[PDB]
Symmetry: C2
Subunit: 904 residues, 2 copies
């Protein structure tokens, strides 16, 4: 609550210096009026505030909007810092002690479990990130300045300077345009998510483990965690996922996957280069002695004058510096090899001259470790050496594995053209049992099918291309090959074919994507049918993985229905696997907002059926969230902490399995929910009309968050639209009726709901999330958009919804036993209280802007300029909307999303 006033005060001043009191006063007022609204709760303020803003001139409007955006951002920044300081002044050491003590588990059990556990976090570039790298940068700088600013040992002059620092970064950020003017490229996006790896996660992982070691010893286990074990791994979709996005061509993958390999190569060099300086021992293994001597006579060259450190030949007097040096040289060709490959077509540098596999890079390293531990000096080995070893297992030769995605109907096109051409029918019109026949005969065969004279097609080729590249690059640089909207088992085979048929060394594994409601239901079906194919079941080798999507599930049905459906689905799927003895691991397509399956990490894991993780899980970090989770130091350390602590516990101390009673009621409710949902968003004709009216869903594409070039469509904008209007329709629409039903059915059921909310994790967490949403909603604000945009005829329709909101919230609070929303979290409300008034301003602002943009005959009374006098307006060359209107709008969305902490 302190830093808040600090960052804000600072900003307000800069504002005044750059633009003069007049304007600083305006922003100052807006807050006041919004306050009276958020405080006394009198709706007259919103209308008054509206008069204040509709008068502003283009430049002032763009400024005013921008001003609130920055203040809001700052708020979030202050909050992070405050959270960090507090909580230091959850934790594995905790969960271990708790598991061993309370739950009582042999430390060996823990240790083992820990060893056999792996949480793969895959970053994805879903258009969920609003801020641009430019501002995200200034932020990390302000965070850092704000921290050192609270240093309890900095002199006077010291502080004085740090302050000046904080201010100019604030001003610099204020001075840059936050409206990304062009759509990013797939390569640019990968360069974004990558920034975190070589800036916070790279040197983070090793530290995280050091703590996981300290913890282990604190529980008795006087043994560090083996460096080969990898508790957490990072994968990426930036460059691999090409579903619905034509811009991710097969070359884009070569480039991004090559560039990433160069970065790793580069990082490790700094590692080794120094490591050499540290391992200056001479007492070595009988084994290392040999290995070293050989490299001594083999090199013989020392003329490397361009080497800053360790230029002339290293004497065998320093055994490790010898091997390390070698490893380094090979590392340079690996970096340069890639450079050329990227720059020109090829490289003079030979394949054998560089590292092409992880084993090739480990053998030398591992050697030093053994040598050290053997010749005594183990501790010296457990130092920087142990850290590097861990990095290699976590990051490997290409910072992160790359997944691949593509809707199967594309694979059908390819396979169909191949059959048509060869004169053997239309694979398309083939019955599933027929396709499985042909496809299985082929997989068993030995004779090539891919005809060289095959008639290509931009897409029929774009897909073959992808596969080829998969063959070019190493086997390790890739993750699984996901098949969007793929149903029948033939769909998984058609890919198994193309992989080998397009020549692929170690064909990557195939994993289906069950997201649409329907697919999630018939999910355990296709799953079993697939384990019934001998060939497959045989090449699979026990290990199997399937991806479950959280976004579209509740888009076509309720949130409640979907939430339960995904539970059931991954619940059964876990048996259809257990029955066929396959280690099925689930890939969770969790978003940023609760509406798309998001929410606190430990809670989300706890809400998953018992016995369906067992130390193996993949989870998506959608764009925006990457910032949230690994933006800072401590932040990253928490995300890693959180994930492994939850996954570990969910295994050795599973959640409760739903009582038969609950299941029945749950299944029954889910129906009511979906019937309630589809009834209004689907069955109601004029709904969509009302939808594209009371919300800025239409203007979503203007922000330019991604590189993807209507009722039945898109989900990110869907969630977004109501998050802006602060209504959250989608997140709760079902729940209203689902509850009233279980009660109107039998009065005693109410006591059941209360029973569930108190004993069933899935259910408590599900409700607990909806409370947070309601805590960020405001039917008042929703009404304003209605009144201003929604037509007269359907005006009353809005009110109905407005009522369902309230009704659902009461029911929600009763079941939970809360007399007040977020009655549980006091600080979470404190924050809101400070924020809300700023958000409410941007709301009213957005509301009237849309009003002006849509109704060109909406008269307004223009006020006199405020800022000291525009090119600020000329920043948007050709705009379809009049003057400041566009930029202003993009700004409001930018900020409202900021204050809310969520884009979509």
């Amino acid at each position: 609550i302190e830093y808040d006033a600090l960052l804000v005060d600072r900003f307000l001043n800069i504002l005044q210096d750059l633009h003069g009191p007049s304007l600083r006063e305006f922003v100052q007022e807006c807050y006041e009026v919004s306050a009276d609204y958020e405080g006394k709760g009198d709706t007259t303020k919103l209308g008054e505030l509206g008069a204040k803003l509709t008068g502003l001139a283009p430049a002032d409007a763009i400024l005013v909007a921008s001003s609130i955006l920055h203040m809001l951002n700052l708020a979030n920044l202050a909050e992070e810092v405050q959270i960090a300081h507090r909580r230091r002044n959850s934790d594995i050491e905790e969960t271990l002690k708790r598991l061993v003590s309370e739950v009582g588990k042999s430390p060996e059990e823990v240790f083992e479990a820990l060893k056999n556990q792996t949480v793969d976090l895959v970053f994805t570039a879903h258009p969920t990130q609003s801020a641009r790298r430019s501002l995200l940068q200034k932020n990390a700088r302000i965070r850092n300045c704000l921290t050192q600013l609270n240093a309890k040992d900095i002199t006077d002059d010291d502080k004085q300077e740090l302050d000046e620092a904080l201010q100019r970064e604030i001003q610099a950020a204020f001075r840059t345009d936050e409206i990304r003017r062009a759509q990013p490229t797939p390569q640019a996006e990968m360069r974004y998510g990558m920034s975190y790896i070589h800036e916070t996660v790279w040197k983070g992982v090793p530290k995280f483990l050091r703590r996981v070691d300290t913890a282990l010893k604190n529980i008795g286990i006087n043994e560090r965690l083996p460096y080969n074990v990898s508790l957490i791994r990072f994968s990426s979709w930036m460059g691999g996922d090409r579903d619905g996005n034509p811009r991710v061509t097969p070359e884009v993958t070569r480039d991004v996957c090559l560039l990433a390999r160069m970065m790793a190569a580069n990082l490790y060099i700094d590692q080794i280069e120094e490591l050499m300086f540290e391992l200056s021992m001479w007492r070595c293994n009988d084994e290392l002695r040999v290995r070293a001597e050989e490299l001594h006579s083999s090199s013989g060259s020392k003329v490397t004058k361009y080497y800053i450190e360790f230029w002339k030949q290293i004497p065998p007097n320093e055994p490790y510096r010898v091997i390390l040096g070698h490893v380094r040289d090979k590392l340079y060709n690996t970096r340069e090899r890639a450079r050329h490959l990227l720059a020109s077509g090829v490289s003079e540098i030979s394949a054998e001259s560089s590292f092409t596999s992880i084993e090739e890079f480990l053998e030398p390293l591992e050697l030093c470790y053994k040598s050290l531990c053997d010749c005594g000096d183990k501790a010296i080995a457990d130092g920087s050496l142990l850290d590097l070893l861990r990095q290699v297992f976590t990051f490997g030769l290409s910072l992160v594995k790359l997944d691949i995605r593509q809707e199967s109907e594309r694979h059908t096109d390819v396979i169909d053209a191949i059959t048509t051409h060869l004169g053997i029918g239309s694979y398309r019109e083939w019955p599933e049992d027929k396709r499985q026949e042909w496809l299985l005969s082929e997989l068993r065969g030995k004779r090539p099918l891919l005809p060289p004279d095959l008639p290509q097609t931009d897409e029929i080729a774009d897909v073959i291309g992808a596969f080829h590249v998969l063959a070019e690059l190493p086997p390790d640089s890739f993750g699984p090959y996901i098949i969007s909207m793929a149903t029948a088992p033939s769909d998984v085979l058609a890919v198994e074919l193309l992989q080998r048929e397009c020549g692929v060394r170690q064909p990557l594994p195939v994993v289906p994507l069950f997201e649409r409601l329907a697919d999630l239901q018939s999910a355990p079906a296709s799953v079993e049918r697939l384990f019934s194919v001998d060939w497959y079941m045989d090449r699979i080798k026990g290990k199997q993985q399937v991806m479950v999507g959280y976004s579209d599930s509740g888009k076509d049905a309720g949130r409640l229905s979907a939430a339960w459906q995904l539970y059931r689905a991954q619940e059964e799927m876990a048996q259809v696997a257990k029955r066929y003895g396959v280690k099925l691991t689930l890939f969770h397509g969790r978003g940023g907002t609760v509406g798309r399956g998001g929410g606190p990490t430990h809670l989300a894991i706890l809400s998953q059926p018992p016995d369906t993780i067992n130390g193996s899980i993949r989870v998506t970090v959608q764009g925006e969230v990457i910032e949230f989770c690994f933006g800072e130091e401590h932040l990253c350390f928490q995300t890693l902490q959180r994930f492994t602590a939850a996954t570990l516990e969910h295994g050795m101390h599973p959640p409760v399995s739903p009582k038969p009673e609950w299941r029945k009621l749950m299944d029954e409710m889910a129906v009511v929910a979906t019937e309630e949902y589809r009834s209004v968003v689907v069955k109601e004709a004029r709904f969509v009309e009302y939808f594209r009216s009371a919300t800025p869903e239409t203007e979503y594409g203007r922000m330019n968050i991604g590189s993807r070039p209507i009722t039945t469509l898109r989900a990110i904008p869907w969630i977004f639209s109501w998050t802006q209007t602060r209504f959250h329709l989608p997140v709760w629409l079902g729940v209203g009726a689902a509850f009233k039903f279980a009660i109107d059915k039998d009065v005693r059921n109410f006591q059941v709901l209360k029973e569930m909310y108190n004993e069933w994790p899935f259910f408590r967490v599900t409700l607990d999330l909806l409370e947070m949403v309601f805590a960020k909603g405001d039917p008042g604000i929703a009404g304003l958009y209605d009144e201003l945009l929604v037509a007269e005829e359907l005006k009353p329709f809005g009110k109905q919804l407005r009522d369902k909101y309230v009704e659902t919230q009461q029911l929600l609070l009763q079941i939970a036993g809360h007399k007040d929303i977020l009655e549980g979290d006091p600080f979470l409300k404190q924050g809101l209280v400070l924020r809300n008034p700023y958000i409410t301003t941007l709301n009213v602002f957005q509301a009237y802007t849309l009003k002006r943009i849509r109704d060109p005959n909406f008269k307004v009374t223009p006020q006199p300029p405020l800022s000291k006098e525009a090119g600020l307006v000329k920043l948007n060359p050709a705009s379809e909307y009049p003057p400041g209107l566009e930029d202003t709008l993009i700004l409001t969305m930018k900020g409202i999303a900021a204050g809310m902490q969520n884009t979509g």
Copy 2:
């Protein structure tokens, strides 16, 4: 005394945890014992240790030697922390206040003077760094872990993980052979001293400067210190100084001056890259709008796939990023250019393709700074953009300038031979008057001289070739050409010629190096003569530099004499200059030890004739001192602080000019101090034998410190010798007599001696330095080497010096009015008490070790190996001296060197 134990304690725990509880104890005992002598004086106990020590197995002798070495080392580490942590609770701001407040100066007068001040700190690689470069890395590591381990906001886990690291690091340095086996190379030496630049000084400079900006504000001036103004500058000798060192071929010169530019260009990139992410405003100069418009308009729309950031074309909406990006590329070439010129022979990268002059590089950067200013974002410009500008004006493209040093005679060798080969006789035999006449006319001629067919010694080449390398390399990468042993005006005119006769664009400026007493006295004349030759005066352009040695200077003549002479030297020289209106600046060849003109920065600059410094001053940093003065960041900041402060005062608050009485008496004691001096080193053949008899001089080389191979000895080895044996004979020799004499010549002089040590800065510092010297010398250890290595013959001669020593020390304390030594510095004495007992033990282990070499028939009763065991000793294959002696001797030196915190 805090870490003083913390560190030592863990060392032992590791020591016994690695070699057996016995060795830990033995080492303990040897201190326990030696602690008694230092606290008693009965040299009787000493003999005991000697017996035991020599009776240790070769392997154990090493271990026991290294232990006391690594221990003593630690003491120096814990002491560096004990100072920071306690000081963190001299200063320019202070000095600026004291000047405007107390001295009554105009804040504008102080600012102005600060803009015209400059302090060139010249790093050199003298064989003074008796520390392994591989060991230094680990010391820094330790210091860092010691500081952090003593924070307050760290947790228990944090503390345990840190203390854990701090040990594995101490164990790392121990498990590493501290004796360098292969002698260094000129390239390896420039590399050692260079690390400090990019590892500390590169970032340090901008910081120190901002602070100065802060100070200037904290006293009035609300304007920053212009970025083009450089308070400090960095220069090197490493690769340019070839005096006395043959191994520095003219190739090594281009070699290092090339590598340096590759590093400079390199560092600049990391900076510029970063600053590209910062400056992201869209507002700019009409000038910059135009400029950036062109760059974007041209240079295609190319993408650089191997570029991590800003790979694609930059939009012109980011003016600053356009220009800066172009600077980055220009930078990448420059970095690649030199990279090639080193490794291969030439480069494809064009001349225009990269940066050649600082102007090319500045022009753009300055364009931005002014653009940001004009457009209101001065506060933004003063951020990272200023720091870079400050670096550019301080490091240039070379990073550090290079001085070239060659003995005067070596230039005669050439000129003499190019006359002998031509018609006219011999230069060498010509009278000085002749030399000037000829050389002058020759310099005014138009017809060549240097004959093609001229024969060439392996020496006449090494000098003429060097002159060619200077022709090739760029003018900005060179300092002056320093003529060691400068004597007469011809000496300068000879290089003035040779230079033009070997073809040089910008003939480096030539500067005399008056180092022998003889030349010092005559110096003022020479300097005036050179100002007399119209030709020279015209090429001088008003400025003039002249170095003055301390090392060899105090060699021929006693310390006192030399010290006084040097004063008069610069005293008159200044007057001469002043007479001809020449901005004479002096280059100070200050050593590391008091014997080579060492001591506290401020004290030193203080003890210099008033009105000789003012504008500028150059100072050397002899190898060992570099680690000192720039080892840590806090060290660097303070060093910069010290110089600029001291230097600023000496200008506005000059010291007192000696009183005629003082002058006279000084001159007198001067001759008396040399008399007693040379009389024992020159006018005595019995001496030379005692030297090689009592001090381990002939062992200096066994350390492979630098690459450089009676009066035939250098300064360093000289002092090194008497410093190990704790006698420091060369530093106090003359003094004793100078005093006694003036005490007899008259009694009123005792009151005049005291009267001087109170009011005259120079006379004070000199004695104060001495007191420290004596504060380290112990005649006990002095004579111990007699009864062990001194010939029974001149055994008394030794005891005769013993009495002069003690007589001198006594009289000193009398003049200073002190009871004890360092009486006025409880900290230091407290340090000797805890450190000495260790140094002693090493002296004991050294005096006997020298005998086990000098006297083969020395019977010593062996003992059982204390450690748990061969290969240790077999680390030195080809060694003349028996088993563990070769190594133990070098070790005992290295160890004592650390104890005394000085070598040469």
